Scaffold this motif. Structure first.
Motif, PDB file in Angstrom:
ATOM      1  N   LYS A 193     -29.595  19.976  -2.231  1.00  0.00           N
ATOM      2  CA  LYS A 193     -28.971  19.041  -1.291  1.00  0.00           C
ATOM      3  C   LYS A 193     -27.461  18.860  -1.600  1.00  0.00           C
ATOM      4  O   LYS A 193     -26.586  19.192  -0.787  1.00  0.00           O
ATOM      5  N   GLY A 194     -27.197  18.348  -2.808  1.00  0.00           N
ATOM      6  CA  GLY A 194     -25.858  18.069  -3.320  1.00  0.00           C
ATOM      7  C   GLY A 194     -25.916  17.004  -4.409  1.00  0.00           C
ATOM      8  O   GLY A 194     -24.905  16.461  -4.852  1.00  0.00           O
ATOM      9  N   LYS A 195     -27.114  16.669  -4.843  1.00  0.00           N
ATOM     10  CA  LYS A 195     -27.221  15.652  -5.841  1.00  0.00           C
ATOM     11  C   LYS A 195     -26.880  16.414  -7.078  1.00  0.00           C
ATOM     12  O   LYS A 195     -27.483  17.453  -7.315  1.00  0.00           O
ATOM     13  N   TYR A 196     -25.918  15.980  -7.874  1.00  0.00           N
ATOM     14  CA  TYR A 196     -25.634  16.821  -9.031  1.00  0.00           C
ATOM     15  C   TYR A 196     -26.255  16.188 -10.270  1.00  0.00           C
ATOM     16  O   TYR A 196     -26.824  16.892 -11.136  1.00  0.00           O
ATOM     17  N   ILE A 197     -26.287  14.860 -10.269  1.00  0.00           N
ATOM     18  CA  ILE A 197     -26.650  14.145 -11.420  1.00  0.00           C
ATOM     19  C   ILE A 197     -28.036  14.449 -11.947  1.00  0.00           C
ATOM     20  O   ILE A 197     -28.282  14.351 -13.179  1.00  0.00           O
ATOM     21  N   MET A 198     -28.943  14.730 -11.023  1.00  0.00           N
ATOM     22  CA  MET A 198     -30.223  15.377 -11.324  1.00  0.00           C
ATOM     23  C   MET A 198     -30.213  16.209 -12.619  1.00  0.00           C
ATOM     24  O   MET A 198     -31.102  16.089 -13.486  1.00  0.00           O
ATOM     25  N   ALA A 199     -29.208  17.083 -12.691  1.00  0.00           N
ATOM     26  CA  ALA A 199     -29.014  18.020 -13.807  1.00  0.00           C
ATOM     27  C   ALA A 199     -28.900  17.410 -15.249  1.00  0.00           C
ATOM     28  O   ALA A 199     -29.020  18.139 -16.221  1.00  0.00           O
ATOM     29  N   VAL A 232     -29.423  28.322   0.645  1.00  0.00           N
ATOM     30  CA  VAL A 232     -29.731  27.570  -0.560  1.00  0.00           C
ATOM     31  C   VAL A 232     -28.876  27.938  -1.785  1.00  0.00           C
ATOM     32  O   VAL A 232     -28.311  27.035  -2.455  1.00  0.00           O
ATOM     33  N   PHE A 233     -28.771  29.232  -2.070  1.00  0.00           N
ATOM     34  CA  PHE A 233     -27.955  29.703  -3.182  1.00  0.00           C
ATOM     35  C   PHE A 233     -26.533  29.173  -3.060  1.00  0.00           C
ATOM     36  O   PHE A 233     -25.892  28.854  -4.059  1.00  0.00           O
ATOM     37  N   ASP A 234     -26.046  29.080  -1.827  1.00  0.00           N
ATOM     38  CA  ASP A 234     -24.705  28.569  -1.578  1.00  0.00           C
ATOM     39  C   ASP A 234     -24.649  27.063  -1.809  1.00  0.00           C
ATOM     40  O   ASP A 234     -23.621  26.530  -2.226  1.00  0.00           O
ATOM     41  N   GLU A 235     -25.760  26.382  -1.543  1.00  0.00           N
ATOM     42  CA  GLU A 235     -25.862  24.955  -1.818  1.00  0.00           C
ATOM     43  C   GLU A 235     -25.742  24.735  -3.319  1.00  0.00           C
ATOM     44  O   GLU A 235     -24.734  24.220  -3.802  1.00  0.00           O
ATOM     45  N   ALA A 236     -26.773  25.136  -4.055  1.00  0.00           N
ATOM     46  CA  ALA A 236     -26.700  25.180  -5.535  1.00  0.00           C
ATOM     47  C   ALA A 236     -25.231  25.251  -5.903  1.00  0.00           C
ATOM     48  O   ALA A 236     -24.712  24.304  -6.507  1.00  0.00           O
ATOM     49  N   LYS A 237     -24.571  26.329  -5.451  1.00  0.00           N
ATOM     50  CA  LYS A 237     -23.143  26.510  -5.561  1.00  0.00           C
ATOM     51  C   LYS A 237     -22.266  25.295  -5.251  1.00  0.00           C
ATOM     52  O   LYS A 237     -21.532  24.902  -6.158  1.00  0.00           O
ATOM     53  N   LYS A 238     -22.306  24.725  -4.036  1.00  0.00           N
ATOM     54  CA  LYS A 238     -21.417  23.625  -3.726  1.00  0.00           C
ATOM     55  C   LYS A 238     -21.660  22.412  -4.652  1.00  0.00           C
ATOM     56  O   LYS A 238     -20.759  21.627  -4.986  1.00  0.00           O
ATOM     57  N   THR A 239     -22.919  22.242  -4.996  1.00  0.00           N
ATOM     58  CA  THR A 239     -23.322  21.016  -5.573  1.00  0.00           C
ATOM     59  C   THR A 239     -22.850  21.147  -7.009  1.00  0.00           C
ATOM     60  O   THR A 239     -22.471  20.146  -7.654  1.00  0.00           O
ATOM     61  N   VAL A 240     -22.837  22.402  -7.458  1.00  0.00           N
ATOM     62  CA  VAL A 240     -22.359  22.769  -8.792  1.00  0.00           C
ATOM     63  C   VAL A 240     -20.849  22.571  -8.876  1.00  0.00           C
ATOM     64  O   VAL A 240     -20.362  21.864  -9.770  1.00  0.00           O
ATOM     65  N   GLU A 241     -20.103  23.137  -7.942  1.00  0.00           N
ATOM     66  CA  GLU A 241     -18.670  22.853  -7.944  1.00  0.00           C
ATOM     67  C   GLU A 241     -18.448  21.325  -7.829  1.00  0.00           C
ATOM     68  O   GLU A 241     -17.476  20.802  -8.364  1.00  0.00           O
TER      69      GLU A 241
END
Length: 460
Positions: A193-199, A232-241
């Motif tokens: 989605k874009g939740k980063y804090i999850m990590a 999805v792979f691109d999402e992972a990506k945005k959410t990571v940046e």
């Protein structure tokens, strides 16, 4: 009447085939197994018909007639007989009513698989159950009837004039080819989605934790990347940046080494998910291929045929074999016959891309059963000289480098045909390319399993 091909073993096969051969006059001139093939089928007429250009996209009928012509006299008698012989029809039917557990995953998923895309392993169990199948009955009697095996053709020798045309076909196959490049999985949903804090605290634990070898993280994305699918792979990506710049903003509340290691870790993970996705989508393509014998027998078991009842089917596909009757009649006749198996087979039919699954009957795929059982009328095998053409019989056509070019010429002919009827890059499937496709992997016979074969669609 009464399967005439009373053959239980190779040595009987050999005996029957000879009795057959004198009685009928075979020259394996242009075929890998003795044919009724006297010359090379000629489809010239069809070119000119095609131009005729009716609108009823038939065309389809023209192509079917060409096909008929190509296939009419060139059935691999010896092999076809062995596949329809008594010994093989028993064992081969009995196997299903005995290996029910082994099939479930696509079996119990036949109704749904009729409309829905198979699981990766619905495919792999099929392929695996194919070989298990071939091996357990002794389907082995020849090289035309073995599982391959080794490797794809690196070179394909073609006589000078079809050299080009073939490569036009090749380039097309290429493009077409290249169109292709439970809880942790949910966590992945939350994350992409874009939740980063999850990590900071995943359930399984650490972000670099592995399942049974590979990073769970990657394995997760890979899975979710094909139920919700770049993307999805691109999402992972945005959410990571997104994460990056979060960590940049609170550098002072964060451990420096850890926070950078975190980004490359997940970044490394998402690149492995990509790879993995890729690898399964290749696995997929691969698992697509029908095993003619096995699939046909599965439908036999499915429609409720028995040995006793098989000659009726064989006959029927034989009859089907000279007709240019369309699917209509083909359906009308199946819904009509007093033979119980008739309605069952129809019922198996699908109609509601490819990915279908090699174990799902359809109208076209009747041709599979045709090759297996309809080139020779079990109840009286001499009627086989009348000639009954089914698609796959086409691989009985010689490819010998030096003289005998048949296989490719016929297929090439058929490609031109297809070409002149329709825009060639713009149809969804290209029947002839599939055939050329099957010759290139090195099948010498419809009765071969090509699934173990290594290597590609590269020309040369």
């Amino acid at each position: 009447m009464e399967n005439k091909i009373e053959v239980n073993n190779k040595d009987e096969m050999n005996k029957w085939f000879e009795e057959f051969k004198k009685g009928n006059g075979l020259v394996d001139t242009f075929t890998n197994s003795y044919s009724f093939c006297e010359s090379v089928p000629n489809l010239d007429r069809f070119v000119f018909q095609m131009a005729s250009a009716t609108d009823d996209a038939q065309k389809d009928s023209i192509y079917a007639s060409a096909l008929v012509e190509a296939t009419k006299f060139c059935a691999p008698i010896y092999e076809c007989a062995w596949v329809s012989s008594t010994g093989i029809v028993k064992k081969g039917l009995e196997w299903f009513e005995k290996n029910a557990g082994t099939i479930k995953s696509w079996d119990e998923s036949y109704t749904e698989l009729k409309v829905e895309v198979p699981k990766i392993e619905q495919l792999a169990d099929y392929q695996q159950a194919a070989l298990k199948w071939r091996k357990d009955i002794g389907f082995r009697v020849n090289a035309n009837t073995t599982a391959l095996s080794h490797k794809v053709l690196a070179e394909y020798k073609v006589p000078g004039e079809i050299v080009m045309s073939v490569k036009e076909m090749l380039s097309d196959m290429i493009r077409r080819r290249n169109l292709i490049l439970r809880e942790h999985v949910e966590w992945c949903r939350e994350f992409v989605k874009g939740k980063y804090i999850m990590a900071f605290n995943p359930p399984w634990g650490d972000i670099n934790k592995s399942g049974r070898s590979g990073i769970a993280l990657v394995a997760t994305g890979l899975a979710k990347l094909a139920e919700t699918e770049k993307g999805v792979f691109d999402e992972a990506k945005k959410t990571v940046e997104a994460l990056n710049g979060y960590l940049n903003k609170h550098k002072d509340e964060v451990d420096k080494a850890s926070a950078d290691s975190m980004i490359t870790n997940l970044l490394k993970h998402i690149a492995k998910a990509q790879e993995l996705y890729k690898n399964s989508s290749a696995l997929r393509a691969q698992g697509a291929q029908i095993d003619t014998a096995f699939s046909s027998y599965y439908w036999l078991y499915k429609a409720g045929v028995t040995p006793e009842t098989f000659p009726t089917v064989s006959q029927f596909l034989f009859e089907l074999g000279k007709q240019p009757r369309g699917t209509k009649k083909m359906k009308k006749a199946l819904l009509s016959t007093p033979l119980k198996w008739g309605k069952k087979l129809y019922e198996l039919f699908a109609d509601d891309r490819i990915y279908m699954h090699p174990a799902v009957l359809t109208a076209g795929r009747i041709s599979e059963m045709g090759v297996c059982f309809g080139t020779i009328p079990v109840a009286n095998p001499d009627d086989a000289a009348q000639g009954s053409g089914h698609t796959k019989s086409i691989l009985n056509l010689r490819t010998n480098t030096e003289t005998n070019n048949p296989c490719a010429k016929t297929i090439v002919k058929l490609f031109e045909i297809q070409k002149t009827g329709f825009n060639i890059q713009d149809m969804d499937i290209v029947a002839s390319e599939h055939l050329l496709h099957q010759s290139l992997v090195g099948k010498q016979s419809p009765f071969q399993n090509a699934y173990n074969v290594k290597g590609n669609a590269t020309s040369a």
